[PDB]
Design brief:
Elements: E1 4-7, E2 10-13, E3 15-19, E4 22-31, E5 54-56, H1 76-79, E6 93-98, E7 106-112, H2 130-136, E8 139-142, H3 148-152, H4 165-180, E9 186-196, H5 198-208, H6 210-213, E10 218-222, H7 235-248, H8 256-265, H9 268-274, H10 302-308, E11 316-321, H11 326-332, H12 346-356, H13 362-371, H14 381-409, E12 415-420, H15 441-444, H16 457-476, E13 498-502, E14 509-511, H17 515-531
Bound molecules: 2-acetamido-2-deoxy-beta-D-glucopyranose (NAG) (2 copies) and 3-[(1S)-1-(dimethylamino)ethyl]phenol.
EC number: 3.1.1.7
Active site: 197, 324, 437
Protein name: Acetylcholinesterase
Length: 532
């Protein structure tokens, strides 16, 4: 039976799923770890004890306990990211889409969802691996991991809540793929891990972490870097927030044992309710529980690891979307609202700058403002709005990614950089938000091929082109077809620093993606703040 697969953990029974006039197998909800419930909350993941009998892998699993966005009730643009299954601490499962007939040893792609490490689901409609698995003949896997305090509460030194447990969930899922994907026709020697936002950061973190390197072949990072300012915290900061969380829940704060015991007795929603109260600054684009630089998962500082070449050397394909800041400005900056063009005043511009660079002194704030202000037309509401979008995006995603790409490329075996600047025609979010972060995913997952989704013919073509770029790269370490008549996506080199735009227009190659702004963020500003 094509829908029955025997693994080292037990037999699983998938389901025949229809996809673009055909069908494929889908093994949904396969457990890869023991439910992190009870005294297991905050602890490292334990492997899923093998089971007797057949595991029903015909339906999606529960989503992990997480903060749910309710800013725009009923709005698809926001709810399309919210959990679409019952939330549960028992959420460490993975889904696999297998081509029919079951392949023998084909390329495997493992998707790691984003969501600032505080949210995310593998079951979202935009993450349906159906189209990519079918169109590209790949075994597509989507894993899950604990988010929020559940996956990142860090009381370093403690065995009960060491921190980084959400990253270990990812690793365990990767371990399970390593050990069993062969039974689904996947080639364990050719596994490409790919993710967006916190998932992209995660991908880079697995490239860095010694304990994860051997579990995959290549990597794809979309709008995420392990070095993003919001993707990790020091062990001191993690401990600080863990205690403050306990303080929010009236916990005995005399010992880690009592803090952790208290936190474990709290219902999931209780931790989620006060989750955001632990942030150190009035800021945007900062999340409470994220990976901690523990000296275990990450041997030393990300920067030193990057400098020394202390990371997995392989091929990587990565990039960003044009407007990486609009989302967090809409949700937290004064003057922005979903239903207006959000033209920003000078007053709100400076308030935004302050929210964007949390612990920057006045001089730092001045450096940012001068850098992003057109003094010939400083009251231009559209320029002030777009200027803020750039500040938030550059600082939080684009420039950190550029720093990582340049550091990596020095030791890597091939880099491919893209700049996705096509706004989906059916995008429900306002126009001012632009090519919003996360809206390239639908193209990566081939949603534009489904006519009912209302995409243009051009968008379907772009989707197919992106999917083939992703799959060909995952399969060969090069997004380009060996000897083809199509425009060639050049390799990013330390010298040339080439990249391509990803849109419905004919491929165009550029160099030094936002160098001007990134020299400011990566070189100048850090030096300024260090001195002051
Ligand atoms: C779960 O597995 C059983 C195996 O007998 C199957 O009959 C059932 O239909 C599956 N659940 C769903 C919702 O299909
Ligand atoms: C990648 O590695 C192979 C073998 O070590 C080498 O021949 C090739 O030149 C490398 N490519 C890049 C872009 O570094
Ligand atoms: C999916 C994506 C997202 C995109 C836009 C808005 C959200 O609230 C979440 N994650 C990765 C950060």
């Amino acid at each position: 039976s094509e829908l029955l697969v025997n693994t080292k953990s037990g037999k699983v029974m998938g389901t025949r799923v229809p996809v673009l006039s055909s069908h494929i197998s889908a093994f949904l909800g396969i457990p890869f770890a023991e439910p992190p419930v009870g005294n297991m909350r905050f602890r490292r993941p334990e492997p899923k004890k093998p089971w007797s009998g057949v595991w029903n892998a015909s339906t999606y699993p529960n989503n992990c306990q997480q903060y749910v966005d309710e800013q725009f009730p009923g709005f698809s643009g926001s709810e399309m990211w919210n959990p679409n299954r019952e939330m549960s601490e028992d959420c460490l499962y993975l889904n696999i889409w297998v081509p029919s007939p079951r392949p023998k040893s084909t390329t495997v792609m493992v998707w790691i969802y984003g969501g600032g490490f505080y949210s995310g689901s593998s079951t979202l409609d935009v993450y349906n691996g159906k189209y990519l698995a079918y169109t590209e003949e790949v075994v597509l896997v989507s894993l899950s991991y604990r988010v929020g305090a559940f996956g990142f509460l860090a009381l370093h030194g403690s065995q009960e809540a060491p921190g980084n447990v959400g990253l270990l969930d990812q690793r365990m899922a990767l371990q399970w793929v390593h050990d069993n994907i062969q039974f689904f026709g996947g080639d364990p020697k050719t596994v490409t891990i790919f993710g967006e936002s916190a998932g992209g950061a995660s991908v880079g973190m697995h490239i860095l972490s010694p304990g994860s390197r051997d579990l995959f072949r290549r990597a794809i990072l979309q709008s995420g870097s392990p070095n993003c300012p919001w993707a990790s915290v020091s062990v001191a900061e993690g401990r600080r927030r863990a205690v403050e969380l306990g303080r929010n829940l009236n916990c005995n704060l005399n010992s880690d044992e009592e803090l952790i015991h208290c936190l474990r007795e709290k219902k999931p929603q209780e931790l989620i309710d006060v989750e955001w109260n632990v942030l150190p600054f009035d800021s945007i684009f900062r999340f409470s529980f994220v990976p901690v630089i523990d000296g275990e998962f990450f041997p030393t500082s990300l920067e030193s690891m990057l400098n020394s070449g202390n990371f997995k050397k392989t091929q990587i394909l990565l990039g960003v979307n044009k407007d990486e800041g609009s989302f967090f400005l809409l949700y937290g900056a004064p003057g922005f609202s979903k239903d207006s063009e959000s033209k920003i005043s000078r007053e709100d511009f400076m308030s935004g700058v302050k929210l964007s660079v949390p612990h920057a002194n006045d001089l730092g704030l001045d450096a940012v403002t001068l850098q992003y202000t057109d003094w010939m037309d400083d009251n231009n509401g559209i320029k002030n709005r777009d200027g803020l979008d750039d500040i938030v995006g550059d600082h939080n995603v684009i420039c950190p990614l550029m720093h990582f790409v340049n550091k990596y490329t020095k030791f890597g075996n091939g880099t491919y950089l893209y700049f996705f600047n096509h706004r989906a025609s059916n995008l429900v979010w306002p126009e001012w938000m632009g090519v919003i972060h996360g809206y390239e995913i639908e193209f990566v997952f081939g949603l534009p091929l489904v006519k009912e989704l209302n995409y243009t013919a051009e968008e379907e073509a772009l989707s197919r082109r992106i999917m083939h770029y992703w799959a060909t790269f995952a399969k060969t370490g090069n997004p380009n077809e060996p000897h083809s008549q199509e425009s060639k996506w050049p390799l990013f080199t330390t010298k040339e620093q080439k990249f391509i735009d990803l849109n419905t227009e004919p491929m165009k190659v550029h160099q030094r993606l936002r160098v001007q702004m990134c020299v400011f963020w990566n070189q100048f500003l850090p030096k300024l703040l260090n001195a002051t």
